[PDB]
């Protein structure tokens, strides 16, 4: 995306991070960005 590219890669999705080193596949809070572009963040602001 042209408007705010650095926010749509660092962070990416509207689901917040919870990353624990003890767990291998960390699916706590954040769902893994698929696809990483404008996507669900643009639809939640209405765009």
């Amino acid at each position: 995306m042209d408007v705010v590219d650095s926010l749509l890669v660092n962070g990416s999705n509207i689901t917040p991070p919870c990353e624990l080193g003890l767990e291998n596949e960390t699916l706590f809070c954040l769902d893994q960005p698929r696809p990483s572009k404008e996507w669900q963040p643009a639809q939640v602001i209405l765009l």
Binding site: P35, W39, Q40, Q43, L46
Partner: peptide, 8 residues
């Protein structure tokens, strides 16, 4: 689909 909820 993500572009789909409001595709307009």
């Amino acid at each position: 689909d993500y572009m789909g909820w409001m595709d307009f």
